[PDB]
Design an enzyme around this catalytic site. Structure first.
Site, short mmCIF file in Angstrom:
data_model
loop_
_atom_site.label_atom_id
_atom_site.label_comp_id
_atom_site.label_asym_id
_atom_site.label_seq_id
_atom_site.Cartn_x
_atom_site.Cartn_y
_atom_site.Cartn_z
N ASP A 89 -6.33 8.68 -0.57
CA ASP A 89 -6.01 7.46 0.41
C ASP A 89 -4.72 8.08 1.36
OD1 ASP A 89 -7.72 5.79 -1.16
OD2 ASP A 89 -5.99 5.67 -2.56
N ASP A 103 -11.74 11.09 -8.02
CA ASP A 103 -13.09 11.00 -7.49
C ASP A 103 -13.47 11.97 -6.39
OD1 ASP A 103 -11.99 9.50 -5.28
OD2 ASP A 103 -13.08 7.84 -5.70
N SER A 137 -11.68 11.82 -3.58
CA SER A 137 -11.20 10.99 -2.46
C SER A 137 -9.69 11.10 -2.43
CB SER A 137 -11.87 9.61 -2.11
OG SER A 137 -11.32 8.68 -2.90
N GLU A 150 0.65 -1.21 0.08
CA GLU A 150 -0.12 0.12 -0.14
C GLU A 150 0.94 1.14 -0.04
OE1 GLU A 150 -3.95 -1.49 -0.55
OE2 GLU A 150 -3.05 0.43 -0.51
N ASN A 169 -7.20 10.75 -5.49
CA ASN A 169 -7.68 10.06 -6.55
C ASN A 169 -8.59 11.19 -7.26
OD1 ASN A 169 -7.04 7.63 -5.92
ND2 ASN A 169 -8.10 7.94 -4.01
N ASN A 196 -9.00 5.22 2.98
CA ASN A 196 -9.74 6.13 1.91
C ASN A 196 -10.53 7.15 2.62
OD1 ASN A 196 -12.23 6.62 -0.16
ND2 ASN A 196 -10.32 6.81 -1.25
#
Length: 129
Positions: free
Chosen positions: A52, A48, A50, A35, A46, A59
């Site tokens: 992480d 969208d 969001s 990760e 991201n 997220n």
């Protein structure tokens, strides 16, 4: 902070992740490796809306609140900045909540694609625990 594998394994063991909901310690160390490459300050923004955050790339739509993500649920009840600490406690506590809220470790795409199936005990082999 960038952790060493054995140092991270020991910290995760101190926080009780070994055999949490039937997932051995090596699974958690492997998830963190793929990760974030063990980097507590990792962020992935991201398209969208969001983001992480942290060593376990949690997220911001469902799990933590960063104030900028549409549809936020904040199910771990924390600011996302708490996941970018050098201390792994907030990330471990939220990861436990992710599994408790009806998810296995398949919630981490890197676990599913790079750890599942494999000899995840390699990730703690040779470490002082």
């Amino acid at each position: 902070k960038v952790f060493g594998r054995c140092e991270l394994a020991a910290a995760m063991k101190r926080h009780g992740l070994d055999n949490y909901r039937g997932y051995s310690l090596g699974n958690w160390v492997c998830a963190a490796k793929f990760e974030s490459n063990f980097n507590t300050q990792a962020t992935n923004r991201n398209t969208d809306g969001s983001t992480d955050y942290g060593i376990l790339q949690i997220n911001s739509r469902w799990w933590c609140n960063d104030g900028r993500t549409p549809g936020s649920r904040n199910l771990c009840n924390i600011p996302c900045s708490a996941l970018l600490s050098s201390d792994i406690t907030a990330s471990v506590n939220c990861a436990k909540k992710i599994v408790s809220d009806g998810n296995g470790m398949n919630a981490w795409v890197a676990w599913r694609n790079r750890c599942k199936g494999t000899d995840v005990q390699a990730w703690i082999r040779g470490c002082r625990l």
